[PDB]
């Protein structure tokens, strides 16, 4: 899951 | 003459990060999507709350209007898109097929088709009436960050963390052109320009670029903001002075002169990353929205 609740609000991983 | 965007309204109600805001083509409404699984509708001129639209099982990353302002489509972590009737607030269709989070979406100008991009690295083209997928494009080698139709719907531009922008023939699904960078930073947003001949692309090295589609090369570069972590929307502002507008990871809205690339305004007020901005179709009005520490949408108006 995306902890923030959606993909767009999740910071991109390296 | 430089703009003087000033805060007029702050729109509260989402309970998690806002992900996307969009003005209806008729100028009457603003739609917002959020990580809270909700879509909200607000008055475009005064930010007056109108309604909440619900149904997705997980958070939503994007929402978009049909040309006649009657329909919305949303893209969700639940791996689906939903088509909504705005007036009734009901879900007309659930578009199933993606195998990972759906990230971005748009209607074509005719609004008989929807295009979507997903973390499954594909672009899909859907029939609005039947709710069924027409084409799945093996578009990219990494998540698809944005999808947009050109002005007659004959082309789709897509972007990806793979560093590519690709232009697709809508009718066949085949690739027409790939826009290439030696340095290849992840591309986080793309959109065709108001005149149809340029593409605006954001990359996660704090840069926006205006590409000449025909020639396949960069014409303008805009810098000064912060963008290394999120897929932040950008816009052409055309109702007054000709600007580029974007959110930023330093919590500001940036406005550049399109031609000179100079920053002409920075809008201060949000308390988290400004993930999304939109420009009103006829008035000098900007909407902005922010991530979880803020979770509000702001409406700004300029005299020019």
A7 touches B: beta carbon within 8 Å = yes
Q: How many CA atoms lie within 13 Å of B5's alpha carbon, on the beta-carbon side?
A: 29
Q: In Å, how far is B18's CA from the nearest CA of chain A?
A: 8
Residue B231: its chain A contacts at CB < 8 A? 8
Q: What's the structural domain count of chain B? A: 1
Contact A8 B275 (CB under 8 A): yes
Instruction: Provide the token pair at B244.
Output: 């580029």
Q: For an interface test with B, which of A6, A12, A14 has the most B Cβ atoms less than 10 Å from its Cβ?
A: A6
Q: What is the 3-state secondary structure (H, E, C) of chain B?
A: CCCCCEEEEEECCCCCCEEEEEECCCCCEEEEEECCCCEEEEECCCCCEEEEECCCCCCEEEEEECCCCCEEEEEECCCEEEEEECCCCCEEEEEECCCCCEEEEEECCCCCEEEEEECCCCEEEEECCCCCEEEEECCCCCCEEEEEECCCCCEEEEEECCCCEEEEECCCCCEEEEECCCCCCCEEEEEECCCCCEEEEEECCCEEEEEECCCCEEEEEECCCCCCCCCCCEEEECCCCCEEEECCCCCCEEEEECCCCCEEEEECCCCCCEEEEEECCCCCEEEEEECCCCCCEEEEECCC
C-alpha to C-alpha distance for B115 and B127, rounded to whole angstroms: 9
Distances (CA, A) of B35 to B59, B62, B127, B141: 4, 10, 26, 25
Name the interface residues of B facing A (CB cutoff 8 Å). Answer: 16-17, 19-20, 34-37, 58-62, 76-77, 101, 103, 119, 143, 161, 186, 204, 228-231, 275, 291-292
A12 interaction partners in chain B (CB closer than 8 Å): 161, 186, 204, 228-230
**CB-defined contacts A:B, below 8 A:** 68
- The CATH number of whichever domain residue B154 belongs to comes to 2.130.10.10
Tokens representing residue B267 in the block: 């809008």
- Cα(A12)–Cα(B232) distance, rounded to whole angstroms? 12
Domain membership of residue B244 as a residue range: 1-304
Pick from B140, B146, B80: which is nearest to B117 by CA? B146
d(CA B298, CA B286): 8
Please judge whether A5 and B58 are an interchain contact, meaning their C-beta atoms are less than 8 angstroms apart.
Answer: yes
Q: What is the least distance, in Å, from the CA of B20 to any CA of chain A?
A: 9
**Residue B55: left if φ>0, alpha if ψ -120 to 50, beta else—which one?**
left
- Closest CA in chain A for residue B17: A9
Chain A interface test: which of B61, B270, B294 (most A C-beta within 10 Å): B61
Resolution in A: 1.3
- CB atoms A9 and B35 under 8 Å: yes
Which chain A residues are Cβ-neighbours of B76 within 8 angstroms? 6
Give which of B267, B270, B272 is closest to B284, Cα–Cα: B267
Instruction: Say if the Cβ atoms of B17 and A5 lie within 8 Å.
Output: yes
Q: Which residue of A has its CA nearest to B78?
A: A6
Q: State the structure-solving technique.
A: X-ray
Using CB atoms, pick whichever of B35, B143, B161 lies closest to residue A4.
B35
Q: Chain B residues with CB inside 8 Å of A5's CB?
A: 16-17, 34-37, 58-59, 77
Contact call for residues B289 and B296 (beta carbons, < 8 A) = yes
CB–CB contact B61 A8 (8 Å) = yes
């Amino acid at each position: 899951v995306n902890p923030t609740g959606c993909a767009r609000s999740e910071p991109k991983m390296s | 003459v430089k703009p003087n965007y000033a805060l007029k309204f702050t729109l509260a109600g989402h309970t998690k990060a806002v992900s996307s805001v969009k003005f209806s083509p008729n100028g009457e409404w603003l739609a917002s999507s959020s990580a809270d699984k909700l879509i909200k509708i607000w008055g475009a001129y005064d930010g007056k709350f109108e309604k909440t639209i619900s149904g997705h099982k997980l958070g939503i990353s994007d929402v978009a209007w049909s040309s006649d302002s009657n329909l919305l489509v949303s893209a969700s972590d639940d791996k689906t898109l939903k088509i909504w009737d705005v007036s009734s607030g009901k879900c007309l269709k659930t578009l199933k097929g993606h195998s990972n989070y759906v990230f971005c979406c748009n209607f074509n100008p005719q609004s008989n088709l929807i295009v979507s991009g997903s973390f499954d690295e594909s672009v899909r083209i859907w029939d609005v009436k039947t709710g069924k997928c027409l084409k799945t494009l093996p578009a990219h080698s990494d998540p698809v960050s944005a999808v947009h139709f050109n002005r007659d719907g004959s082309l789709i531009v897509s972007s990806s963390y793979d560093g590519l922008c690709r232009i697709w023939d809508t009718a066949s699904g085949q690739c027409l052109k790939t826009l290439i960078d030696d340095d290849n930073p992840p591309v986080s947003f793309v959109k065709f320009s108001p005149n149809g001949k340029y593409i605006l692309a954001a990359t996660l090295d704090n840069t926006l670029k205006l590409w000449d589609y025909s020639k396949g090369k960069c014409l303008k570069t805009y810098t000064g903001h912060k963008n290394e972590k999120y897929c932040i929307f950008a816009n052409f502002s055309v109702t007054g002075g000709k600007w580029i507008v974007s959110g930023s990871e330093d919590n500001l809205v940036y406005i550049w002169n399109l031609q000179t690339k100079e920053i002409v305004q920075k809008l201060q007020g949000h308390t988290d990353v400004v993930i999304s901005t939109a420009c009103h179709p006829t008035e000098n009005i900007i909407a902005s929205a922010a991530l979880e520490n803020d979770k509000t949408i702001k409406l700004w108006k300029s005299d020019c």
